[PDB]
Amino acid sequence: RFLKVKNWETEVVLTDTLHLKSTLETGCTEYICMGSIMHPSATKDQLFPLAKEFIDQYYSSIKRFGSKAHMERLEEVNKEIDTTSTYQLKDTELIYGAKHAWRNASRCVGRIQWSKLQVFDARDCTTAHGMFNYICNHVKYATNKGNLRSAITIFPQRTDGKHDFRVWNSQLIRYAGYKQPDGSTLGDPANVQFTEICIQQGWKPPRGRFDVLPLLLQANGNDPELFQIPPELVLEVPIRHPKFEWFKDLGLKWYGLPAVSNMLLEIGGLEFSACPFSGWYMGTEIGVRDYCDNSRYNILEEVAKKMNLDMRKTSSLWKDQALVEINIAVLYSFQSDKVTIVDHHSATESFIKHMENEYRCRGGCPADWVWIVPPMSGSITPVFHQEMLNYRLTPSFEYQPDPWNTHVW
Amino acid sequence: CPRFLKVKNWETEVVLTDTLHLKSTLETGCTEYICMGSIMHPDVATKDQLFPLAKEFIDQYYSSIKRFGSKAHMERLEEVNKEIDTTSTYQLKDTELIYGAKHAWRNASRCVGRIQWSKLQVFDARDCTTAHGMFNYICNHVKYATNKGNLRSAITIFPQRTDGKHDFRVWNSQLIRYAGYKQPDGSTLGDPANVQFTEICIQQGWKPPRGRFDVLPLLLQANGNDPELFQIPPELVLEVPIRHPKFEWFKDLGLKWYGLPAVSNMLLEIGGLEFSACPFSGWYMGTEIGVRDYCDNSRYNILEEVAKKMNLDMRKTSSLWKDQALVEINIAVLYSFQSDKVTIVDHHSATESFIKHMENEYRCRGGCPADWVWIVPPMSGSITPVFHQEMLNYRLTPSFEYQPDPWNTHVWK
Ligand code: HEM
Ligand code: HEM
Ligand SMILES: Cc1cc(N)nc(CCc2cc(CC[C@@H]3CCCN3C)cc(F)c2F)c1
Ligand SMILES: Cc1cc(N)nc(CCc2cc(CC[C@@H]3CCCN3C)cc(F)c2F)c1
Ligand SMILES: C[C@H](O)[C@H](O)[C@H]1CNc2nc(N)[nH]c(=O)c2N1
Ligand SMILES: C[C@H](O)[C@H](O)[C@H]1CNc2nc(N)[nH]c(=O)c2N1
Ligand SMILES: [Zn+2]
């Protein structure tokens, strides 16, 4: 049936028909909603219908459904799965599928950009050195001297599960984290464990507060290998405040390129377990989560110190004051260094415009409210007031298990 | 459905195990293929529908008092069954009414204040017959709950629905709200959210002061009759002028708010009985006023004026002038309430209390249904502990439910 979503601020009512096309589960039932669970719970016979559905929507997207080219592709794909237990996507299908996995990512507020995506085909890669070369070209292309460009690099698909290509880093660029003897943590505490895998594999840690981690790349199921991204390819921004001149003395920096490297791209039943993709940051990703999560850099006390705020009672909102100033600094710093960044007001507004577009031309837009609403100032952004329907469309980005939990050395 | 469901807290790594969801009774709106968790809203019971609903409730009540299967339990079941047989309804005992109201709060997945659920004063108003009598009961509620600023949570329960043509309803959505007036030029005076109800009040005879913070009259419907207007005695309406501890100019904005949040449009369901008039009240979390009431665009919408008095760059959104003003508005609200010794809770203490409450409920009860979309405060979400807490949402009974607006269904006499 048709379903209606309403924006309680504007009273706009959009009508969703696109959800009728889903078949993957969401995790919910009629009796329990799992909307805030972060991760709720092939063969030749599983593969062809998935392939058929994907080929069908591709040829339907270029408005040649049931065409001769369409019909031959179906048989081409049928014979190929038959004789080989898998198949290979055409270039056009690879690009279509990657853009549409982004389009369908319900947790991404940046999707108004979905059709501007540079797709790098790396399916001829065979070694970790080749992966490193492909990844360096990606980073260079996407960074573009601060004029960031969305990109994805796609390595060979899964075959038997024993020859997987994996980027073991969860993101291409991250800072190391170190367990200090006295119990505290230097660097990024989220990466203490991965840093120790790199140390244990031979990485010489500078043991600073913002050490860019090496790449750890696994090709064709082999043991992973370490590589250092050339530093001139790693663009970084010293964080300073437009009014508080003491802010630069905090010694804070961050990298310009957000690039998720641990997800699985599924297209037509094929699984690409190494598909690093990147865009540009929304300021709150750095200013709220990375810097102010209690389990991340956790800088709120320090900033509130220099601001000389009353920190004895929570109801002074000293944390909320320091939070806003930290996020002002991040936006100001990136903009002053001409590095692409978007504030959560502009991003959410664009996302509302995007939803409007997708409802008109596509009949819906899957969206996960829990993730779309920014982690600060929620209700002064328009998405807070926007009812959203969440559902799973394919091609898609999915989570997969960490490689250090399954790999036999 | 699986017997054990696990939720995780991603900041602390604490994993909790839920079995209470097996007792889920109503529908969420979600399916296996679509989640409706951000949808705001996703003729009486017959004898056959009523029997199992009542037994379910009575069994639960007698379990809670460690008398399950007792002689009193079997006798109460038999008496209730006979009453439904001969009268097609039944009456709750005072103990059962109190238990059911506290558990509807305890079950309210959208409420972050539930650590308090067992301290709820219940006023049995099932003997009320007229709107005047409703007015008396509501005044006593307001006075009791306000307590000169040392607020006490309370509920007043009017007679249950019979055939649906004799409903008791409070037409007000909340007991205390400010009027809103649409102007000929399209601007709005007062609270724009309340323009429709205000128009109804004026139509029913209310003389409007046409100010910015005019307390609305009560519009009260007894036994399905036409509703009648009453003015709450102003000495019973505690209000707080908003000032800022640092910014001397903040009081010059002329802002104030009422002290008592009292929801009066919900339906209380106990044992299949429907209490269509059950006003309940607690105390405010500051963000309800400082973020939503004051800074929602379609509400009082003061961010602009505060930012100007703060002399902020309002040309670029990336200056975060909105965020900066929003914080100071919420600082003023908490400061003004604490200075006047009116109970209020900030969003940091409320969410910490809720996490502790949720853990205890998981321990002692096997779960705690919670609606993350509502539990996370509307500002500074991720620096509160609920942001990082996975929650399962499901509908237990007794429950508070939404119901149609009474002007949309009432048959005028
Ligand atoms: C171009 C600018 C982009 C912006 C501003 C943006 C913004 C965001 C933000 C703020 C999140 C939440 C991330 C978190 O809290 O961990 C997110 C999630 C996500 N984004 Fe985008 N993004 C962009 C580009 C892209 C691209 C190019 C892709 C894929 C080709 C993508 C796919 C995703 C996915 C799959 C998620 C969910 C990841 C997860 O569930 O962990 N995004 N995005
Ligand atoms: C005693 C202190 C209390 C606090 C701090 C508190 C806090 C809150 C807050 C912040 C909300 C969200 C309101 C909104 O965003 O519109 C809420 C909702 C709710 N509360 Fe509580 N509350 C309290 C007492 C109560 C009581 C006494 C009851 C019932 C006996 C109750 C039942 C509910 C219900 C049913 C909702 C959902 C309302 C809806 O869906 O519109 N609360 N509470
Ligand atoms: C393409 C794109 C654009 C954009 N603007 N942002 C992103 C996300 C970037 C990102 C994510 C994470 C993981 C956060 C984990 C995952 C689940 C819980 N959370 C703690 C770590 C990072 F270092 C990072 F940069 C991607
Ligand atoms: C017992 C209790 C304690 C507490 N702390 N808060 C509350 C809520 C109080 C409350 C609710 C509403 C409804 C807001 C509507 C409903 C959905 C959309 N929203 C615009 C308006 C109010 F004026 C009000 F005071 C109740
Ligand atoms: C428990 C909850 O699902 C978890 O904290 C989510 C909440 N919303 C989020 N939203 C975004 N964008 N990113 C996140 O990591 C999270 N974390
Ligand atoms: C669309 C969305 O569901 C709606 O704006 C909700 C979001 N969460 C909320 N949370 C609370 N506490 N109160 C609300 O009114 C809302 N509104
Ligand atoms: Zn759901």
Coordinates of C-alpha atoms in Angstrom, one line a residue, chain A:
Chain A
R1 CA 0.0 0.0 0.0
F2 CA 1.0 3.7 -0.3
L3 CA 2.5 5.2 2.8
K4 CA 2.6 8.9 3.8
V5 CA 5.4 10.8 5.5
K6 CA 4.7 14.2 6.9
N7 CA 7.0 17.1 7.9
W8 CA 5.6 18.5 11.1
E9 CA 7.2 21.9 10.6
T10 CA 6.1 22.5 7.0
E11 CA 3.1 20.1 7.0
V12 CA 4.3 18.8 3.6
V13 CA 3.1 15.2 3.0
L14 CA 5.0 13.0 0.6
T15 CA 3.7 9.6 -0.6
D16 CA 6.0 6.6 -0.6
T17 CA 5.6 3.9 -3.3
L18 CA 9.2 2.9 -3.6
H19 CA 9.2 0.8 -0.4
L20 CA 7.1 -1.8 -2.3
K21 CA 10.3 -2.8 -4.1
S22 CA 12.2 -4.0 -1.0
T23 CA 13.0 -7.6 -0.1
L24 CA 15.8 -7.4 2.4
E25 CA 14.7 -7.4 6.1
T26 CA 15.0 -4.3 8.3
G27 CA 15.1 -6.1 11.6
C28 CA 11.7 -4.9 12.9
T29 CA 8.5 -6.9 13.3
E30 CA 5.0 -5.8 13.7
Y31 CA 5.7 -6.1 17.5
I32 CA 9.2 -4.9 18.1
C33 CA 11.0 -1.9 16.4
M34 CA 14.7 -2.1 16.2
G35 CA 15.2 1.3 14.6
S36 CA 18.1 2.2 16.9
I37 CA 20.0 -1.1 16.8
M38 CA 23.2 -0.4 14.9
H39 CA 23.6 -3.9 13.4
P40 CA 20.4 -5.9 13.5
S41 CA 20.3 -9.6 12.5
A42 CA 26.2 -17.4 -2.6
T43 CA 25.2 -20.2 -5.0
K44 CA 24.2 -20.4 -8.7
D45 CA 20.5 -20.7 -7.6
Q46 CA 20.6 -17.8 -5.2
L47 CA 22.6 -15.7 -7.8
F48 CA 20.6 -15.6 -11.0
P49 CA 17.4 -14.0 -9.6
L50 CA 19.5 -11.4 -7.9
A51 CA 21.4 -10.9 -11.1
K52 CA 18.2 -10.8 -13.1
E53 CA 16.6 -8.2 -10.8
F54 CA 19.7 -6.0 -11.0
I55 CA 20.0 -6.2 -14.8
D56 CA 16.3 -5.6 -15.0
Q57 CA 16.4 -2.3 -13.1
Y58 CA 19.6 -1.2 -15.0
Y59 CA 17.9 -1.6 -18.4
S60 CA 14.8 -0.1 -16.9
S61 CA 16.9 2.9 -15.7
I62 CA 18.2 3.6 -19.2
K63 CA 14.7 3.1 -20.6
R64 CA 15.4 0.0 -22.7
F65 CA 13.5 -2.5 -20.7
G66 CA 12.9 -5.7 -22.6
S67 CA 15.1 -4.5 -25.4
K68 CA 17.3 -6.7 -27.5
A69 CA 20.4 -5.6 -25.6
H70 CA 18.5 -6.3 -22.3
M71 CA 17.5 -9.8 -23.5
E72 CA 21.0 -10.8 -24.6
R73 CA 22.5 -9.6 -21.3
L74 CA 20.1 -11.8 -19.3
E75 CA 21.2 -14.8 -21.4
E76 CA 24.8 -13.8 -21.3
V77 CA 24.5 -13.6 -17.5
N78 CA 22.6 -16.8 -17.3
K79 CA 25.2 -18.8 -19.3
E80 CA 28.0 -17.2 -17.3
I81 CA 26.6 -18.1 -13.9
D82 CA 25.9 -21.6 -15.3
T83 CA 29.4 -22.4 -16.5
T84 CA 31.4 -20.3 -13.9
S85 CA 29.3 -20.1 -10.7
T86 CA 29.4 -16.3 -10.9
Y87 CA 29.5 -13.4 -13.4
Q88 CA 31.2 -10.1 -14.2
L89 CA 29.5 -6.8 -14.4
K90 CA 29.8 -4.6 -17.4
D91 CA 31.6 -1.3 -16.8
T92 CA 28.3 0.6 -17.2
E93 CA 26.6 -1.7 -14.7
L94 CA 29.5 -1.3 -12.2
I95 CA 29.1 2.5 -12.3
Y96 CA 25.3 2.3 -12.2
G97 CA 25.4 -0.1 -9.3
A98 CA 27.9 1.9 -7.2
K99 CA 26.0 5.2 -7.6
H100 CA 22.8 3.4 -6.7
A101 CA 24.3 1.8 -3.5
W102 CA 25.1 5.4 -2.4
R103 CA 21.6 6.5 -3.5
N104 CA 20.1 3.7 -1.4
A105 CA 22.2 4.2 1.7
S106 CA 19.5 5.1 4.2
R107 CA 21.9 6.4 6.9
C108 CA 23.6 9.0 4.6
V109 CA 22.6 12.6 4.7
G110 CA 24.9 13.6 1.9
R111 CA 22.9 11.7 -0.8
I112 CA 21.9 14.8 -2.9
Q113 CA 25.4 14.2 -4.5
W114 CA 24.7 10.5 -5.3
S115 CA 25.0 10.8 -9.1
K116 CA 28.3 12.7 -9.0
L117 CA 30.5 9.8 -8.0
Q118 CA 33.9 9.0 -9.7
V119 CA 34.0 5.2 -10.0
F120 CA 37.4 3.6 -10.2
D121 CA 37.3 0.0 -11.5
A122 CA 40.1 -2.0 -9.8
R123 CA 38.8 -5.5 -10.6
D124 CA 42.0 -6.4 -12.3
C125 CA 44.0 -6.0 -9.1
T126 CA 45.7 -9.1 -7.8
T127 CA 48.2 -8.1 -5.0
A128 CA 48.4 -5.8 -2.0
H129 CA 50.9 -3.6 -3.9
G130 CA 48.3 -3.1 -6.6
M131 CA 45.7 -2.3 -4.0
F132 CA 48.1 0.3 -2.5
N133 CA 48.6 1.9 -5.9
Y134 CA 44.9 2.0 -6.6
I135 CA 44.2 3.5 -3.2
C136 CA 46.9 6.2 -3.5
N137 CA 45.4 7.2 -6.9
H138 CA 42.0 7.4 -5.2
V139 CA 43.2 9.5 -2.2
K140 CA 45.0 11.9 -4.6
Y141 CA 42.0 12.2 -6.9
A142 CA 39.4 12.6 -4.2
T143 CA 41.5 15.1 -2.2
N144 CA 42.2 17.4 -5.2
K145 CA 44.1 20.0 -3.1
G146 CA 41.1 20.5 -0.9
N147 CA 38.4 20.7 -3.6
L148 CA 37.1 17.3 -2.5
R149 CA 35.5 14.9 -5.1
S150 CA 33.4 11.9 -4.2
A151 CA 35.0 8.7 -5.3
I152 CA 34.9 4.9 -4.9
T153 CA 37.5 2.3 -5.8
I154 CA 36.2 -1.3 -6.4
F155 CA 38.5 -4.3 -6.0
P156 CA 37.7 -7.9 -7.3
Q157 CA 34.5 -9.5 -6.0
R158 CA 34.3 -12.3 -3.5
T159 CA 34.6 -15.8 -5.1
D160 CA 34.8 -18.6 -2.6
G161 CA 35.2 -16.6 0.6
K162 CA 38.8 -17.8 0.9
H163 CA 40.3 -15.2 -1.5
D164 CA 38.7 -12.0 -0.3
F165 CA 40.2 -8.6 -1.0
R166 CA 40.0 -6.6 2.2
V167 CA 41.2 -3.2 3.3
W168 CA 41.8 -3.9 7.0
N169 CA 41.7 -0.3 7.9
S170 CA 38.1 0.8 8.6
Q171 CA 38.8 4.2 7.0
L172 CA 41.6 5.0 4.7
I173 CA 42.9 7.9 6.9
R174 CA 42.8 7.6 10.7
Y175 CA 44.9 8.5 13.7
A176 CA 46.5 5.8 15.8
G177 CA 45.6 5.1 19.4
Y178 CA 48.0 4.0 22.2
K179 CA 47.4 2.3 25.6
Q180 CA 49.6 4.3 28.0
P181 CA 51.2 2.5 30.9
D182 CA 49.5 4.8 33.4
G183 CA 46.1 3.6 32.0
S184 CA 45.1 6.6 29.8
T185 CA 45.1 6.6 26.0
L186 CA 47.2 8.7 23.6
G187 CA 45.8 9.4 20.1
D188 CA 42.4 8.1 19.0
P189 CA 41.0 5.6 21.5
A190 CA 38.8 4.0 18.9
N191 CA 41.8 2.6 17.1
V192 CA 43.9 1.3 20.0
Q193 CA 43.3 -2.3 18.8
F194 CA 43.9 -1.8 15.1
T195 CA 47.1 0.3 15.9
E196 CA 48.4 -2.7 17.9
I197 CA 47.8 -5.0 14.9
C198 CA 49.9 -2.6 12.8
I199 CA 52.6 -2.4 15.6
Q200 CA 52.5 -6.2 15.9
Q201 CA 53.0 -6.4 12.1
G202 CA 56.1 -4.2 12.1
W203 CA 54.8 -0.6 12.1
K204 CA 57.2 1.8 13.9
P205 CA 54.8 4.0 15.8
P206 CA 55.8 7.6 16.3
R207 CA 53.6 7.6 19.5
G208 CA 52.2 11.0 18.9
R209 CA 48.6 12.3 19.2
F210 CA 47.8 12.4 15.5
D211 CA 49.9 9.7 13.8
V212 CA 48.3 8.7 10.4
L213 CA 48.0 4.9 10.5
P214 CA 49.6 2.8 7.7
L215 CA 47.5 1.0 5.2
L216 CA 47.1 -2.7 5.9
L217 CA 45.9 -4.4 2.7
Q218 CA 44.8 -8.0 2.0
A219 CA 44.6 -9.2 -1.6
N220 CA 43.2 -12.6 -2.8
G221 CA 42.9 -13.9 0.8
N222 CA 46.7 -13.6 1.6
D223 CA 48.2 -12.1 4.7
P224 CA 47.8 -8.3 4.8
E225 CA 50.8 -6.0 4.1
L226 CA 51.7 -2.6 5.5
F227 CA 52.1 0.6 3.4
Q228 CA 52.6 4.2 4.3
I229 CA 50.5 6.6 2.3
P230 CA 52.8 9.3 1.0
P231 CA 52.3 12.3 3.4
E232 CA 51.9 14.8 0.6
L233 CA 48.7 12.9 -0.2
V234 CA 47.3 13.3 3.3
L235 CA 45.6 16.7 3.6
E236 CA 45.2 17.9 7.2
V237 CA 43.7 21.0 8.8
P238 CA 45.0 22.6 12.0
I239 CA 41.9 23.6 14.1
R240 CA 41.7 27.2 15.3
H241 CA 38.9 29.4 16.5
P242 CA 37.8 32.7 14.8
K243 CA 37.6 34.5 18.2
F244 CA 39.4 32.4 20.8
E245 CA 43.1 32.9 20.0
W246 CA 44.0 30.3 22.6
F247 CA 42.3 27.6 20.6
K248 CA 45.2 26.7 18.3
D249 CA 47.3 26.1 21.5
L250 CA 45.1 23.0 22.1
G251 CA 47.2 21.4 19.3
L252 CA 44.2 19.9 17.4
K253 CA 44.2 18.8 13.8
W254 CA 42.2 16.5 11.6
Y255 CA 42.4 15.0 8.2
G256 CA 40.3 16.3 5.3
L257 CA 39.3 13.1 3.6
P258 CA 36.6 10.8 5.1
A259 CA 36.9 7.5 3.4
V260 CA 35.1 4.4 4.6
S261 CA 37.1 1.3 3.7
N262 CA 35.4 -1.6 5.7
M263 CA 32.0 -2.0 4.1
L264 CA 30.7 -4.5 1.5
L265 CA 29.2 -3.3 -1.7
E266 CA 26.6 -5.7 -3.1
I267 CA 25.5 -5.4 -6.7
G268 CA 23.3 -8.0 -8.5
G269 CA 24.3 -10.7 -6.0
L270 CA 28.0 -10.0 -6.3
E271 CA 29.9 -9.0 -3.2
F272 CA 32.8 -6.5 -3.3
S273 CA 34.3 -6.8 0.1
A274 CA 37.0 -4.1 -0.7
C275 CA 35.4 -0.9 -2.0
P276 CA 36.9 2.2 -0.3
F277 CA 34.6 5.2 -0.8
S278 CA 35.0 8.8 0.2
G279 CA 33.3 12.2 0.0
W280 CA 33.7 15.2 2.3
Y281 CA 33.0 15.8 6.0
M282 CA 30.0 17.2 7.7
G283 CA 31.5 19.4 10.5
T284 CA 29.7 17.5 13.3
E285 CA 31.4 14.3 12.4
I286 CA 34.7 15.8 13.7
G287 CA 33.5 18.5 16.1
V288 CA 30.9 16.4 18.0
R289 CA 31.7 12.7 17.7
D290 CA 35.5 12.5 17.1
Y291 CA 36.4 15.3 19.5
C292 CA 33.7 15.1 22.2
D293 CA 32.6 11.5 22.5
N294 CA 33.7 10.4 26.0
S295 CA 35.4 7.4 24.3
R296 CA 37.1 9.4 21.5
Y297 CA 39.4 12.5 21.9
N298 CA 37.1 13.7 24.8
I299 CA 38.2 17.3 24.8
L300 CA 35.1 19.0 26.3
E301 CA 36.6 19.5 29.8
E302 CA 39.7 21.1 28.4
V303 CA 37.9 23.6 26.1
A304 CA 35.4 24.4 28.9
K305 CA 38.5 25.2 31.0
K306 CA 40.0 27.8 28.6
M307 CA 36.5 29.2 28.3
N308 CA 36.5 29.5 32.1
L309 CA 33.0 28.1 32.3
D310 CA 31.3 27.0 35.6
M311 CA 31.7 23.2 35.4
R312 CA 30.3 22.2 38.8
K313 CA 26.7 21.6 37.8
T314 CA 25.5 20.0 34.6
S315 CA 22.6 22.5 34.3
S316 CA 25.0 25.3 33.5
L317 CA 25.2 23.6 30.1
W318 CA 28.9 24.0 30.1
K319 CA 29.2 21.0 27.9
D320 CA 26.8 22.4 25.4
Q321 CA 28.6 25.7 25.3
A322 CA 32.0 24.2 24.7
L323 CA 30.5 21.8 22.1
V324 CA 29.2 24.7 19.9
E325 CA 32.6 26.5 20.1
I326 CA 34.5 23.4 19.1
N327 CA 32.2 23.0 16.1
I328 CA 32.6 26.7 15.1
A329 CA 36.4 26.1 15.1
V330 CA 36.2 23.0 12.8
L331 CA 34.0 24.8 10.2
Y332 CA 36.1 27.9 10.4
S333 CA 39.4 26.0 10.0
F334 CA 38.4 23.9 7.0
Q335 CA 36.8 26.9 5.3
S336 CA 39.9 29.0 5.9
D337 CA 42.1 26.3 4.3
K338 CA 39.7 26.0 1.4
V339 CA 39.0 22.4 2.3
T340 CA 35.5 21.2 1.4
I341 CA 33.2 20.9 4.5
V342 CA 29.5 21.2 5.1
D343 CA 27.8 22.3 8.3
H344 CA 24.9 20.3 9.6
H345 CA 22.4 23.1 8.8
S346 CA 23.3 23.2 5.1
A347 CA 23.6 19.4 4.9
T348 CA 20.2 18.6 6.4
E349 CA 18.5 21.3 4.3
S350 CA 20.1 19.7 1.2
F351 CA 18.8 16.3 2.4
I352 CA 15.3 17.6 2.7
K353 CA 15.6 19.0 -0.9
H354 CA 16.9 15.6 -1.9
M355 CA 14.0 13.7 -0.3
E356 CA 11.7 16.0 -2.3
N357 CA 13.5 15.2 -5.5
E358 CA 13.5 11.4 -4.8
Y359 CA 9.8 11.3 -3.9
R360 CA 8.8 13.1 -7.1
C361 CA 11.0 11.2 -9.6
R362 CA 11.4 7.9 -7.8
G363 CA 8.4 7.5 -5.5
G364 CA 10.4 7.5 -2.2
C365 CA 13.7 7.8 -0.3
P366 CA 14.7 5.3 2.4
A367 CA 16.1 7.2 5.3
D368 CA 17.2 6.3 8.8
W369 CA 16.1 9.2 11.1
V370 CA 18.4 7.9 13.9
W371 CA 21.4 8.5 11.7
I372 CA 20.2 11.4 9.6
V373 CA 19.5 13.8 12.5
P374 CA 22.8 15.5 13.5
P375 CA 24.4 14.7 16.9
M376 CA 23.9 18.3 18.0
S377 CA 21.1 20.9 17.7
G378 CA 18.8 18.3 16.3
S379 CA 15.5 20.1 16.3
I380 CA 16.8 23.4 14.9
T381 CA 17.6 21.3 11.8
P382 CA 14.7 20.5 9.4
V383 CA 15.3 16.7 9.3
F384 CA 14.4 16.4 13.0
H385 CA 10.8 17.3 12.0
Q386 CA 10.8 15.1 8.9
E387 CA 9.0 11.7 9.1
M388 CA 11.1 9.1 7.3
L389 CA 10.5 5.6 6.2
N390 CA 13.5 3.2 6.4
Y391 CA 13.8 0.2 4.1
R392 CA 16.4 -1.7 2.3
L393 CA 17.0 -1.4 -1.4
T394 CA 19.7 -3.1 -3.5
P395 CA 22.5 -2.3 -4.7
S396 CA 23.6 -1.5 -1.1
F397 CA 26.5 -1.0 1.2
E398 CA 26.5 -3.5 4.1
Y399 CA 28.6 -4.1 7.1
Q400 CA 30.9 -7.2 7.2
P401 CA 32.9 -8.8 9.9
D402 CA 36.3 -7.4 10.8
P403 CA 39.0 -9.3 8.9
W404 CA 41.1 -10.0 12.0
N405 CA 38.2 -12.1 13.3
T406 CA 38.1 -14.5 10.4
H407 CA 41.5 -14.6 8.6
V408 CA 43.7 -17.7 8.8
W409 CA 47.3 -16.6 8.6

